[PDB]
Amino acid sequence: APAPFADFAPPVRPQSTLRRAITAAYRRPETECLPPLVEAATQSKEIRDAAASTARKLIEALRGKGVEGLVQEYSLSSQEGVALMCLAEALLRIPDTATRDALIRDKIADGNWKSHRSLFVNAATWGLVVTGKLTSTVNDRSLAAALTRLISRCGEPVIRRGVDMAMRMMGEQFVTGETIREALKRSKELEEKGFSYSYDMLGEAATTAADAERYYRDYESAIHAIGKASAGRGIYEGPGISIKLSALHPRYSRAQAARVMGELLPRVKALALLAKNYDIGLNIDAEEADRLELSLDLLEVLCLDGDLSGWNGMGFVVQAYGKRCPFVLDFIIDLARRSGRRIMVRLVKGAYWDAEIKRAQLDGLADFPVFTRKIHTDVSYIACAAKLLAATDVVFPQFATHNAQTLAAIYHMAGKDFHVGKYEFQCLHGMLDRPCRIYAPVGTHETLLAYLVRRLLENGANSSFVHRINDPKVSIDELIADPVEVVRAMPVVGAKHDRIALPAELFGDARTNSAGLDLSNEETLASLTEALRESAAMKWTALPQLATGPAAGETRTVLNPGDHRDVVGSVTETSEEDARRAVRLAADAAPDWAAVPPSERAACLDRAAELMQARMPTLLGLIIREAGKSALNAIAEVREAIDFLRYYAEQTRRTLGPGHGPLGPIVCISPWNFPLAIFTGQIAAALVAGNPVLAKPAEETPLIAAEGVRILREAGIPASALQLLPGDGRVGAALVAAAETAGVMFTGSTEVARLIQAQLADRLSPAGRPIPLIAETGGQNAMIVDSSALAEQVVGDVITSAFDSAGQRCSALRVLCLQEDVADRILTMLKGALHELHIGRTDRLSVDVGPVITSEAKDNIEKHIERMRGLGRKVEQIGLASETGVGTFVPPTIIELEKLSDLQREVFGPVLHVIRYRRDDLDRLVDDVNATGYGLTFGLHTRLDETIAHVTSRIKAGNLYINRNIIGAVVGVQPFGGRGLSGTGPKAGGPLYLGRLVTTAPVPPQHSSVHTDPVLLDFAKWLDGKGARAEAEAARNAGSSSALGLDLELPGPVGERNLYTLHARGRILLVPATESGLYHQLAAALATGNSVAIDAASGLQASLKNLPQTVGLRVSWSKDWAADGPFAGALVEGDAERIRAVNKAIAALPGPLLLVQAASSGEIARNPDAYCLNWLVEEVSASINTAAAGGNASLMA
Amino acid sequence: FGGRGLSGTGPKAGGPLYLGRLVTTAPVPPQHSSVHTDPVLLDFAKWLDGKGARAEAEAARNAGSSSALGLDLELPGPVGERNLYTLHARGRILLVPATESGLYHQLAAALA
Amino acid sequence: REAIDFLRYYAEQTRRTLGPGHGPLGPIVCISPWNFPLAIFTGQIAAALVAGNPVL
Ligand SMILES: Cc1cc2c(cc1C)N([C@H]1CN[C@H](C(=O)O)S1)c1c([nH]c(=O)[nH]c1=O)N2C[C@H](O)[C@H](O)[C@H](O)COP(=O)(O)OP(=O)(O)OC[C@H]1O[C@@H](n2cnc3c(N)ncnc32)[C@H](O)[C@@H]1O
Ligand SMILES: NC(=O)c1ccc[n+]([C@@H]2O[C@H](COP(=O)([O-])OP(=O)(O)OC[C@H]3O[C@@H](n4cnc5c(N)ncnc54)[C@H](O)[C@@H]3O)[C@@H](O)[C@H]2O)c1
């Protein structure tokens, strides 16, 4: 077998001194980066005065010199203007110019535009054009009303003017031309006036091999057309081309560096050879920060390649908003000297700022790779311009900026001696005597959208020059302010922006965010390689760790699921006798652990979090080898464990006091698929709530569990409070059945949860109440995609959601639902993206999908696939390398289904099912998704507000995701947990969790609602009318205490809105004994928005005579509980023997595990909280990607 | 300004629905739309699809979309005041149909 | 003030909405109370007139 991690992430080439200086600057503090840039950008008083004069002259000229004319002419509102341009866009899709005009005159202008994909799919873009503001989603009902109104008011003439305006903008303003031939023809004019051109064919972010081939042949054909037109003018006076490397390979990333050098580089070389033959410029555009250093490896190989010698047209963009910018320039200038090629360097400020802030926050990295104050980028730009102007003999500087102040400072910096070829300026199409190159987009209306939104966002940001030059409140004096001197006079030079949170500070004072690792950073990969190798040399063990000490037992090895030859460690498993002994020991330790004050227990959790953060690299290595995870997923799992510890610590400090007594010994049974995070989360919550814990890890992953217990014990948790019992489900069953077990936390399959519930149904606590079970189980998770979604975004989110971790996430996408009109195109792209995944042993950074956990899991998954294939369903699978034979692998698989009912149970593997639906059947489809009985995660890709409102109001799932993937819920941000067959609740990583692990629940932070259920109020009035005054008052009190209607936004990363809401659970089974008991149960259920089914065997029908219709609509009587489900909960009244018998009957009900609450008649009389309203509402988490339209509205401020 | 029940017929004076009552075909008032769809309307449309009443099901879906039920606006006014305007269900509508298709169209309108 | 506001509001609402397909009813009888003898008088009449109806 190959040595573990011997080939984890070797760099493409040895890192030179100059390359290492780039990497070292990646994320340094802004206060460190700025002072040297200030020093380099300083110019003399005489030059600064001359620059301000020149900048003033430029600005006065710009202010002394379209859609707004149309809006003014027809007195359109904003929404009418947007709707009119969406209509014109649609009308221009009709090719035959006479056919379009007939549709306008005879059909459209007569109002019936609806009868002739939403019209408003691209309205966010036209919103930007009309209003200057970006909205993430489209209010399509508002736009439809506006379009009806404006046509009914103004008729054919306004439509004609709209069409002619959209024609001019999309064919002449957004682009230089629709095809390279058209763009070249239109360039003759300004070329005669001294301008030059760089053409951009508008490809980026290839998803499939076919996409990358299409962009390649677009670039190749453009080079021919440009070179033919250039006709020997050369690289300075003649036109050139700009390319994006992300267009040329579907896996352009550091993780796939070997494929990039082997497959992408030859393509760039072939394009460069063609540009050399015509002697035109070929420029590599700069993209995301994590592609910068990868692109340098391509630049270096190309500049050293003798086949390209004799040609100085190779160009490369560097972004001044980047902290590495000066060091990148030092590297390029030295490469120019070594190679003897005069590299064309386009200096830009940077186009991806919002995305870089969001990415660094999501990844929990030390700092940003870009500046956070706009004035810092301006100083960086000027400093880097001074560096470039000092090297014009070896590089050709190209100053790409529209900012008149930046231009004037550089113009005077460059001095009086100028010749064509020394340097040039550049500008974007559609926005002194020095040459000026126009960056010219070329493409059809369809292909233009991503670039166009990015462009229009920059122009609309309050800090941007284009927005300020057009703002009449901004004086010229403000516009010509020297950024260098403004920064130099600041109190702390280079301070971070006050309103942008470092990743560590996302949650402010609540808790410290967990820190991740940058797998694009070569220093990180080099140190992580050594730590991973060292972790594979360790002799990992898992032992039964009882309060008294380690116990003996049957010992066996733990094998790497990706290669059974790799022994990871050894586990000693627990005998059923020792399991029962551990519970007795935990029972005897319970009072001492309960007596540790809650603040000290929380301090132990924070200490364990610090220890896990420090040990992350070693922990990664164990998770990769024991559980078959990739390094990316292992990082996220360790972060989740750290977040659980810190989140439950903070929730404890906010809530727990002397009256919230522990339950007693808690049995925590955890799954193999998150063998550290869910393991840690369950144990941490139970411990910090004051309960001693019996930890039973999954049989497949005991080593990381044992290491998590060692860390918790090292942090201060006493051995009597946390005992580790490795073994199989028989150990789990022995623990559950133990007499002193006071509660069970289970995460695993629904079937096993059902077996645990059955065992607990016979049981009562010493107080005669049911034993609490928190059971978080499977999901049959769906995603619905409509024809307004962006295919490229969808495919990326689908590939991640279905096949990350080999589909072994509870949240994994199982069923993709595609609107019929776009299904073929998305399926084609999805299959193409499937075939770009690398499957193998996960100790290589290049591996995307690892093994499934066992051969039994493999056999079960492959049996499902073959059944589908035998039924004739289309099955797409990628081929597995022969190396996978030594482990247990299932290839990522796509299966096309006819109906949603083709699926029986959850298939816990990398198997995506695809169904198609007609748009008018969307509501029926949501019904069919709900009808599986599951309710865990759900995704929706759409830009249309009406569709969002419809789907999110009708779907029944615990975790909703809009325009993003459906995996990787973040503790305290997307509290995680479903309903129905997916779980009992409360949600892990949410504010109701700890209250389930104490005998009296505390009031969670922010847990309240000003809304009162109206049926509850109707019931309390009815009670008053019947004379039941005490119960009527109790009902009103329940109405006020209920938190139904709570609606919160949770702190998190920029570019995302994370919502948390409390809803009704559904239909609650009521099993009353007395009339007053029934009234209290009904009040509790109605106050939390639920309907009820009342046990008809109680004989209390006469107690509810003549109910108001509003209350009767919610009440049903049940003689056969199993026939009237599924229920979402149960309330029971009776003595201990009655509660036990009812609990057994409820456990036998088919379907979901019901959260049961029981009370005696006397407790109902004595205790207004006899039934806890916290457990009668349902938590829903919704995470909305608000950057999905292409940028961040809030960050534009 | 204007009320319901014994207080008047509506539409409100000084409001955006007023002029539409004085023409034979009412226009779409400014800002008059809603992204919400009544769930019972949706159930009715599905029922219509199930019995093959395709044109009525189409009409029901279009009523569901064009309904402004759930509109919720803040109107411009003086500082120190928040002035809200919302559209709710009216109550129980008396339906006097003559034909089955007429009944389905009336029910769709009321449920939407 | 209210009479002035009715006039200007219904004028603006007309500019935002009314087109050739929004035909008038015909003669409208406007019956007004004594407690707002200018404002409600004007509001009813202005709305009927601007919608294209002659008023009694
Ligand atoms: C003129 C020009 C600009 C760019 C390119 C070519 C030319 C000729 N390159 C293009 C190719 N790919 C880009 C694309 O969208 O597909 S357009 C280019 C650019 N940017 C890249 O990252 N890679 C490239 O290959 N070009 C865009 C350029 O980076 C910039 O976005 C705009 O030109 C605007 O800059 P400006 O100097 O003319 O305007 P200013 O307003 O003075 O500055 C705006 C910039 O300031 C930065 N910024 C904003 N807010 C900030 C905060 N809070 N902190 C730190 N920096 C901030 C941003 O960079 C913003 O763009
Ligand atoms: N909703 C969630 O949060 C969530 C999270 C992760 C995984 N899951 C689900 O976990 C399942 C896959 O993981 P798994 O293979 O570990 O599930 P599993 O049900 O096979 O085993 C989970 C745990 O239960 C133990 N166990 C088995 N039988 C037992 C019994 N009779 N009594 C007591 N304990 C018993 C096992 O030893 C193991 O520790 C999937 O179905 C997944 O959907 C759910």
Side-chain angles (χ1 to χ4, degrees), chain A residues 789-820 822-862 864-898 900-903 906-1028 1030-1062:
Chain A
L790 190 68
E792 285 73 11
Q793 281 186 352
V794 166
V795 172
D797 292 344
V798 166
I799 291 295
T800 292
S801 300
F803 306 122
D804 180 282
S805 305
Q808 305 174 124
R809 293 181 182 258
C810 57
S811 55
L813 177 60
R814 307 308 187 185
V815 178
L816 176 62
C817 311
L818 298 175
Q819 192 185 319
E820 178 59 37
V822 293
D824 284 326
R825 164 141 188 275
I826 291 168
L827 252 179
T828 296
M829 187 175 303
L830 186 61
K831 293 172 187 179
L834 187 77
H835 289 285
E836 298 299 336
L837 303 171
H838 183 353
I839 299 88
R841 199 174 80 182
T842 50
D843 66 328
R844 289 178 172 254
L845 182 67
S846 67
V847 165
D848 299 303
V849 181
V852 301
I853 189 60
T854 57
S855 66
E856 307 90 274
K858 176 176 178 193
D859 291 340
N860 182 80
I861 298 163
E862 296 189 326
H864 167 81
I865 297 173
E866 296 311 308
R867 201 186 121 247
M868 295 297 98
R869 213 192 304 263
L871 305 180
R873 306 296 186 256
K874 290 192 62 172
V875 177
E876 185 82 16
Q877 293 185 304
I878 62 208
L880 297 182
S882 62
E883 287 83 336
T884 64
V886 293
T888 54
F889 291 85
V890 178
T893 297
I894 298 166
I895 301 182
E896 293 174 47
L897 297 182
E898 305 290 316
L900 184 59
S901 51
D902 296 350
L903 271 196
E906 172 193 69
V907 178
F908 205 67
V911 182
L912 178 64
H913 306 86
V914 176
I915 58 194
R916 313 155 76 101
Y917 73 95
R918 298 283 178 182
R919 181 44 181 88
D920 289 350
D921 293 326
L922 175 60
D923 197 53
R924 188 244 290 267
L925 170 63
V926 175
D927 284 342
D928 295 340
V929 175
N930 288 335
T932 70
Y934 291 102
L936 190 42
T937 60
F938 173 82
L940 175 66
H941 272 255
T942 179
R943 271 121 77 116
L944 303 178
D945 282 347
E946 179 197 46
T947 296
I948 294 170
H950 172 186
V951 170
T952 65
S953 68
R954 301 280 262 179
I955 196 74
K956 294 169 183 173
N959 280 78
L960 313 178
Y961 296 93
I962 309 292
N963 294 328
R964 49 152 293 179
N965 69 42
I966 66 173
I967 62 166
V970 172
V971 168
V973 181
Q974 303 97 30
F976 186 80
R979 57 167 324 280
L981 298 175
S982 294
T984 57
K987 287 173 169 284
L992 289 172
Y993 202 69
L994 295 184
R996 191 71 168 123
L997 310 179
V998 289
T999 55
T1000 302
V1003 180
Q1006 300 193 269
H1007 183 88
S1008 69
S1009 175
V1010 302
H1011 306 293
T1012 309
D1013 182 278
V1015 179
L1016 174 283
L1017 290 176
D1018 288 349
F1019 178 62
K1021 284 190 305 179
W1022 177 85
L1023 286 171
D1024 267 329
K1026 289 285 192 198
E1031 286 82 5
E1033 191 180 276
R1036 287 185 298 264
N1037 292 333
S1040 300
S1041 292
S1042 173
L1044 174 72
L1046 177 56
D1047 185 2
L1048 297 175
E1049 172 166 352
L1050 302 180
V1054 303
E1056 198 174 75
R1057 277 179 67 237
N1058 291 292
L1059 310 177
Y1060 171 90
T1061 59
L1062 297 183

Side-chain angles (χ1 to χ4, degrees), chain A residues 74-95 97:
Chain A
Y74 288 88
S75 303
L76 307 178
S77 68
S78 278
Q79 287 295 83
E80 290 169 354
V82 171
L84 175 62
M85 298 306 292
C86 294
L87 173 61
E89 176 200 339
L91 282 170
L92 291 175
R93 278 157 155 264
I94 289 164
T97 299

Side-chain angles (χ1 to χ4, degrees), chain A residues 247-415 417-427:
Chain A
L248 290 176
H249 197 282
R251 299 303 307 281
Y252 176 53
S253 68
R254 173 58 178 85
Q256 306 289 319
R259 288 193 65 192
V260 166
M261 300 307 289
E263 305 164 22
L264 170 42
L265 176 60
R267 300 177 187 150
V268 181
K269 176 181 178 166
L271 292 180
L273 288 170
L274 204 61
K276 165 180 163 179
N277 188 79
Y278 290 111
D279 205 33
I280 72 170
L282 189 159
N283 170 265
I284 302 172
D285 284 353
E287 301 182 79
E288 294 88 347
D290 63 6
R291 290 161 153 173
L292 201 178
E293 294 183 37
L294 179 55
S295 70
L296 293 177
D297 281 308
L298 286 99
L299 179 69
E300 168 130 23
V301 179
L302 293 163
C303 288
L304 298 178
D305 187 320
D307 292 331
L308 290 167
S309 68
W311 169 69
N312 285 327
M314 187 73 80
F316 193 86
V317 180
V318 188
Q319 301 148 312
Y321 70 1
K323 293 177 175 171
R324 292 164 290 170
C325 190
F327 310 92
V328 176
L329 292 175
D330 288 340
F331 171 87
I332 292 170
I333 287 163
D334 171 83
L335 175 61
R337 292 190 205 276
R338 289 189 282 126
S339 67
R341 320 232 171 125
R342 189 155 180 254
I343 300 171
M344 310 181 87
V345 181
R346 178 199 296 152
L347 187 67
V348 304
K349 288 187 191 173
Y352 305 88
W353 184 79
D354 296 328
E356 302 293 354
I357 306 304
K358 174 177 188 175
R359 187 82 258 147
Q361 283 183 347
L362 287 173
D363 291 349
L365 299 181
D367 203 330
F368 301 100
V370 293
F371 300 111
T372 54
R373 301 198 182 210
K374 197 263 181 180
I375 196 164
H376 294 171
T377 297
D378 290 337
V379 173
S380 175
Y381 194 98
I382 292 166
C384 288
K387 181 185 291 287
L388 283 163
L389 286 169
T392 58
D393 56 320
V394 299
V395 298
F396 177 61
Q398 303 162 299
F399 302 108
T401 177
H402 303 112
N403 188 317
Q405 196 283 327
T406 316
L407 289 168
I410 292 167
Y411 175 74
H412 286 285
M413 186 182 298
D417 294 342
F418 182 86
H419 52 95
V420 183
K422 192 191 169 219
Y423 66 90
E424 69 182 16
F425 295 102
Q426 309 194 337
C427 63

